[PDB]
Design a protein around this motif. Structure first.
Motif, PDB file in Angstrom:
ATOM      1  N   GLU A   1       9.716 -20.871   0.095  1.00 30.70           N
ATOM      2  CA  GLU A   1      10.981 -21.328  -0.483  1.00 30.70           C
ATOM      3  C   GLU A   1      11.688 -20.235  -1.268  1.00 30.70           C
ATOM      4  O   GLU A   1      12.919 -20.202  -1.247  1.00 30.70           O
ATOM      5  CB  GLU A   1      10.813 -22.627  -1.319  1.00 30.70           C
ATOM      6  N   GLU A   2      10.935 -19.325  -1.925  1.00 32.04           N
ATOM      7  CA  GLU A   2      11.541 -18.253  -2.733  1.00 32.04           C
ATOM      8  C   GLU A   2      12.081 -17.046  -1.949  1.00 32.04           C
ATOM      9  O   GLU A   2      12.740 -16.171  -2.522  1.00 32.04           O
ATOM     10  CB  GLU A   2      10.678 -17.873  -3.944  1.00 32.04           C
ATOM     11  N   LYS A   3      11.869 -17.058  -0.617  1.00 30.12           N
ATOM     12  CA  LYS A   3      12.342 -16.032   0.307  1.00 30.12           C
ATOM     13  C   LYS A   3      13.871 -15.949   0.353  1.00 30.12           C
ATOM     14  O   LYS A   3      14.387 -14.897   0.724  1.00 30.12           O
ATOM     15  CB  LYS A   3      11.774 -16.269   1.712  1.00 30.12           C
ATOM     16  N   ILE A   4      14.593 -17.043  -0.023  1.00 29.09           N
ATOM     17  CA  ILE A   4      16.073 -17.067  -0.076  1.00 29.09           C
ATOM     18  C   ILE A   4      16.595 -16.040  -1.070  1.00 29.09           C
ATOM     19  O   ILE A   4      17.759 -15.666  -0.988  1.00 29.09           O
ATOM     20  CB  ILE A   4      16.735 -18.453  -0.379  1.00 29.09           C
ATOM     21  N   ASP A   5      15.759 -15.616  -2.028  1.00 29.06           N
ATOM     22  CA  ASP A   5      16.172 -14.601  -3.009  1.00 29.06           C
ATOM     23  C   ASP A   5      16.180 -13.185  -2.398  1.00 29.06           C
ATOM     24  O   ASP A   5      16.818 -12.297  -2.931  1.00 29.06           O
ATOM     25  CB  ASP A   5      15.326 -14.681  -4.292  1.00 29.06           C
ATOM     26  N   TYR A   6      15.524 -12.999  -1.243  1.00 26.68           N
ATOM     27  CA  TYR A   6      15.471 -11.716  -0.536  1.00 26.68           C
ATOM     28  C   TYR A   6      15.876 -12.055   0.903  1.00 26.68           C
ATOM     29  O   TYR A   6      15.014 -12.147   1.786  1.00 26.68           O
ATOM     30  CB  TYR A   6      14.060 -11.115  -0.656  1.00 26.68           C
ATOM     31  N   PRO A   7      17.189 -12.363   1.117  1.00 28.38           N
ATOM     32  CA  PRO A   7      17.619 -12.887   2.418  1.00 28.38           C
ATOM     33  C   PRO A   7      17.385 -12.033   3.641  1.00 28.38           C
ATOM     34  O   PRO A   7      17.243 -12.596   4.719  1.00 28.38           O
ATOM     35  CB  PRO A   7      19.100 -13.246   2.216  1.00 28.38           C
ATOM     36  N   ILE A   8      17.288 -10.699   3.489  1.00 28.04           N
ATOM     37  CA  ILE A   8      17.023  -9.839   4.653  1.00 28.04           C
ATOM     38  C   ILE A   8      15.645 -10.185   5.260  1.00 28.04           C
ATOM     39  O   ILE A   8      15.460 -10.049   6.459  1.00 28.04           O
ATOM     40  CB  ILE A   8      17.198  -8.324   4.305  1.00 28.04           C
ATOM     41  N   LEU A   9      14.682 -10.627   4.426  1.00 26.89           N
ATOM     42  CA  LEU A   9      13.338 -10.985   4.900  1.00 26.89           C
ATOM     43  C   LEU A   9      13.422 -12.141   5.866  1.00 26.89           C
ATOM     44  O   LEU A   9      12.649 -12.208   6.823  1.00 26.89           O
ATOM     45  CB  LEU A   9      12.417 -11.395   3.737  1.00 26.89           C
ATOM     46  N   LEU A  10      14.343 -13.085   5.589  1.00 25.24           N
ATOM     47  CA  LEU A  10      14.574 -14.256   6.424  1.00 25.24           C
ATOM     48  C   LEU A  10      15.343 -13.920   7.691  1.00 25.24           C
ATOM     49  O   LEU A  10      14.970 -14.398   8.747  1.00 25.24           O
ATOM     50  CB  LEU A  10      15.329 -15.344   5.647  1.00 25.24           C
ATOM     51  N   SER A  11      16.449 -13.163   7.611  1.00 26.86           N
ATOM     52  CA  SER A  11      17.203 -12.934   8.865  1.00 26.86           C
ATOM     53  C   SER A  11      16.455 -12.042   9.861  1.00 26.86           C
ATOM     54  O   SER A  11      16.651 -12.166  11.063  1.00 26.86           O
ATOM     55  CB  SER A  11      18.621 -12.421   8.591  1.00 26.86           C
ATOM     56  N   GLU A  12      15.599 -11.155   9.350  1.00 26.33           N
ATOM     57  CA  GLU A  12      14.852 -10.197  10.159  1.00 26.33           C
ATOM     58  C   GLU A  12      13.356 -10.481  10.344  1.00 26.33           C
ATOM     59  O   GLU A  12      12.662  -9.694  11.014  1.00 26.33           O
ATOM     60  CB  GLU A  12      15.127  -8.764   9.646  1.00 26.33           C
ATOM     61  N   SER A  13      12.864 -11.621   9.790  1.00 28.66           N
ATOM     62  CA  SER A  13      11.453 -12.054   9.870  1.00 28.66           C
ATOM     63  C   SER A  13      10.526 -10.912   9.465  1.00 28.66           C
ATOM     64  O   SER A  13       9.644 -10.530  10.226  1.00 28.66           O
ATOM     65  CB  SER A  13      11.113 -12.601  11.267  1.00 28.66           C
ATOM     66  N   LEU A  14      10.779 -10.317   8.287  1.00 27.23           N
ATOM     67  CA  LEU A  14       9.946  -9.224   7.791  1.00 27.23           C
ATOM     68  C   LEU A  14       8.709  -9.758   7.074  1.00 27.23           C
ATOM     69  O   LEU A  14       8.803 -10.686   6.278  1.00 27.23           O
ATOM     70  CB  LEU A  14      10.754  -8.264   6.870  1.00 27.23           C
ATOM     71  N   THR A  15       7.559  -9.196   7.382  1.00 26.46           N
ATOM     72  CA  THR A  15       6.274  -9.612   6.796  1.00 26.46           C
ATOM     73  C   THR A  15       5.778  -8.615   5.750  1.00 26.46           C
ATOM     74  O   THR A  15       4.875  -8.941   4.972  1.00 26.46           O
ATOM     75  CB  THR A  15       5.216  -9.917   7.916  1.00 26.46           C
ATOM     76  N   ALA A  16       6.342  -7.392   5.753  1.00 25.71           N
ATOM     77  CA  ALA A  16       6.076  -6.320   4.774  1.00 25.71           C
ATOM     78  C   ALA A  16       7.333  -5.512   4.598  1.00 25.71           C
ATOM     79  O   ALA A  16       8.042  -5.310   5.584  1.00 25.71           O
ATOM     80  CB  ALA A  16       4.960  -5.408   5.254  1.00 25.71           C
ATOM     81  N   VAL A  17       7.608  -5.004   3.364  1.00 27.17           N
ATOM     82  CA  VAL A  17       8.799  -4.198   3.112  1.00 27.17           C
ATOM     83  C   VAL A  17       8.546  -3.078   2.120  1.00 27.17           C
ATOM     84  O   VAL A  17       7.725  -3.221   1.221  1.00 27.17           O
ATOM     85  CB  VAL A  17      10.066  -5.008   2.669  1.00 27.17           C
ATOM     86  N   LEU A  18       9.292  -1.992   2.282  1.00 25.95           N
ATOM     87  CA  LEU A  18       9.400  -0.850   1.368  1.00 25.95           C
ATOM     88  C   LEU A  18      10.934  -0.623   1.141  1.00 25.95           C
ATOM     89  O   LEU A  18      11.650  -0.472   2.128  1.00 25.95           O
ATOM     90  CB  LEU A  18       8.741   0.400   1.991  1.00 25.95           C
ATOM     91  N   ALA A  19      11.448  -0.681  -0.109  1.00 22.63           N
ATOM     92  CA  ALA A  19      12.883  -0.419  -0.387  1.00 22.63           C
ATOM     93  C   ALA A  19      12.958   0.660  -1.452  1.00 22.63           C
ATOM     94  O   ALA A  19      12.298   0.538  -2.486  1.00 22.63           O
ATOM     95  CB  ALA A  19      13.608  -1.667  -0.862  1.00 22.63           C
ATOM     96  N   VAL A  20      13.676   1.749  -1.157  1.00 25.97           N
ATOM     97  CA  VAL A  20      13.803   2.884  -2.068  1.00 25.97           C
ATOM     98  C   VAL A  20      15.266   3.142  -2.422  1.00 25.97           C
ATOM     99  O   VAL A  20      16.148   2.966  -1.564  1.00 25.97           O
ATOM    100  CB  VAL A  20      13.099   4.169  -1.525  1.00 25.97           C
ATOM    101  N   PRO A  21      15.533   3.625  -3.662  1.00 22.88           N
ATOM    102  CA  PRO A  21      16.910   3.961  -4.016  1.00 22.88           C
ATOM    103  C   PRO A  21      17.354   5.275  -3.366  1.00 22.88           C
ATOM    104  O   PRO A  21      16.542   6.150  -3.113  1.00 22.88           O
ATOM    105  CB  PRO A  21      16.856   4.062  -5.540  1.00 22.88           C
ATOM    106  N   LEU A  22      18.634   5.384  -3.060  1.00 19.99           N
ATOM    107  CA  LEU A  22      19.222   6.622  -2.523  1.00 19.99           C
ATOM    108  C   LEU A  22      20.022   7.195  -3.642  1.00 19.99           C
ATOM    109  O   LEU A  22      20.804   6.480  -4.255  1.00 19.99           O
ATOM    110  CB  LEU A  22      20.115   6.356  -1.306  1.00 19.99           C
TER     111      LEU A  22
END
Ligand SMILES: [Cl-]
Length: 124
Positions: free
Chosen positions: A80-101
């Motif tokens: 249910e808390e996945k709506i706070d990170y919507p890219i995980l839902l549209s792309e069915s991501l099971t693991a992520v790494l996000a870095v600043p540019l």
């Protein structure tokens, strides 16, 4: 373009299923952040994502200037808390790494790498 070709190259070379780059939509003071470039995307639903500063994966990294790592989405977040990170839902991501540019000590974007189907994150 330069960003698209760099994005596809890093994603393939790093062994990732997905990659994306977020930036502020405009110059306007209350401008949202959006996922602008993608690589390995399954659909265009990432374009429906509108993030305010401090919201979603992009907003959080943009605000803090710190990397965000989720080795296992299913363990780290309730379905249910996945709506706070919507890219995980549209792309069915099971693991992520996000870095600043960074440009001249200022965060201008967020670079995200994602895995699907339980494929683990390669060495960060
Ligand atoms: Cl997101």
């Amino acid at each position: 373009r330069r960003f698209q070709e760099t994005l596809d190259k890093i994603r393939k070379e790093e062994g990732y299923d997905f990659a994306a780059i977020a930036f502020y939509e405009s110059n306007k003071p209350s401008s949202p952040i959006k996922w602008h470039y993608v690589s390995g995307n399954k659909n265009n639903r990432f374009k429906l994502i509108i993030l305010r500063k401090g919201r979603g994966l992009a907003g959080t990294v943009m605000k803090t200037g710190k990397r965000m790592v989720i080795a296992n989405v299913g363990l780290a977040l309730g379905p249910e808390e996945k709506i706070d990170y919507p890219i995980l839902l549209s792309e069915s991501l099971t693991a992520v790494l996000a870095v600043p540019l960074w440009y001249k000590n200022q965060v201008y974007g967020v670079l995200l790498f994602g895995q699907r189907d339980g494929r683990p994150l390669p060495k960060i």
